[PDB]
Design a protein around this nucleic acid. Structure first.
Ligand SMILES: [Ca+2]
Ligand SMILES: [Ca+2]
Ligand SMILES: [Ca+2]
Length: 223
DNA sequence: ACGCTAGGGATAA
DNA sequence: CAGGGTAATAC
DNA sequence: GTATTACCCTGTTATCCCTAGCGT
């Protein structure tokens, strides 16, 4: 069987590469569960055909996290992250790291979880039926944060920046989180957009759910 | 005075 | 976060 | 020549974070 090391430098159309990809059939349990959090989060799952295959594109500032993810999707990621250095309209230099997996049908499973009546969206029962503590941990490392950033604060309330979703979508996410994890949470507004507020009352619950998956360089997001 | 909000910005998506 | 562009293989 | 496609690249902001100042 073809070893990843054997094709991680060939052309995208290489014969050996495709043979390699045919050795792979599906994502494992982690890759899938974390996948859910990443898609709700900062990851991007796209298809260049009509849905035959999907790949995942990653871009984050924190390099340590970018590596944790790549290492997680190891078999699916041929190259190390690429340093991206761009200039703003201001003339400032912003640095970030890029990376992605190759396309493969094994990714369709994750993608279809976010497809209804043929349009990307947030299904009503996504939380209840698929979001696991691992998924939640990754959603947090991506869009999570504190409610109160003031110095010397004691409020343990957490937040999930769901600003790119519609209020209806977030309302369903909230319902799922309350029912499945008994989390005391509710939608709030920021920039006239949806964010999830999780009362400090449930911090300890929330924390123990995701603690097994967060990494050191992400612990700063917690109160 | 000060804990807490919601307002707001230069990124980090 | 989304999509766009292409150097590298295949036939 | 035409089909493929992973690894960059660019277009654009909704992001997460900070903090002015409201309410008490
Ligand atoms: Ca995000
Ligand atoms: Ca993030
Ligand atoms: Ca965004």
């Amino acid at each position: 069987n073809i070893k990843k090391n054997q094709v991680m430098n060939l052309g995208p159309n290489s014969k050996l590469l495709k043979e390699y990809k045919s050795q792979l059939i599906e994502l494992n349990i982690e890759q899938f569960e974390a996948g859910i959090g990443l898609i709700l989060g900062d990851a991007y799952i796209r298809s260049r055909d009509e849905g035959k295959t999907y790949c995942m594109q990653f871009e984050w500032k924190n390099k340590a996290y970018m590596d944790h993810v790549c290492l997680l999707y190891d078999q699916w990621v041929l190259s190390p992250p690429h340093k991206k250095e761009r200039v703003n309209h201001l003339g400032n230099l912003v640095i970030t790291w890029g990376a992605q997996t190759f396309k493969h049908q094994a990714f369709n499973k994750l993608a279809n979880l976010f497809i209804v009546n043929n349009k990307k969206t947030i299904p009503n029962n996504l939380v209840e039926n698929y979001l696991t503590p691992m998924s939640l941990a990754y959603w947090f490392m991506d869009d999570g944060g504190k409610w109160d950033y003031n110095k010397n604060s004691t409020n343990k309330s957490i937040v999930l920046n769901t600003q790119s979703f519609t209020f209806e979508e977030v309302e369903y996410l909230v319902k799922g989180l309350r029912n499945k994890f008994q989390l005391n949470c509710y939608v709030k507004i920021n920039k006239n957009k949806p964010i999830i507020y999780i009362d400090s009352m449930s911090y300890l619950i929330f924390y123990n759910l995701i603690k097994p998956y967060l990494i050191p360089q992400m612990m700063y997001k917690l109160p």
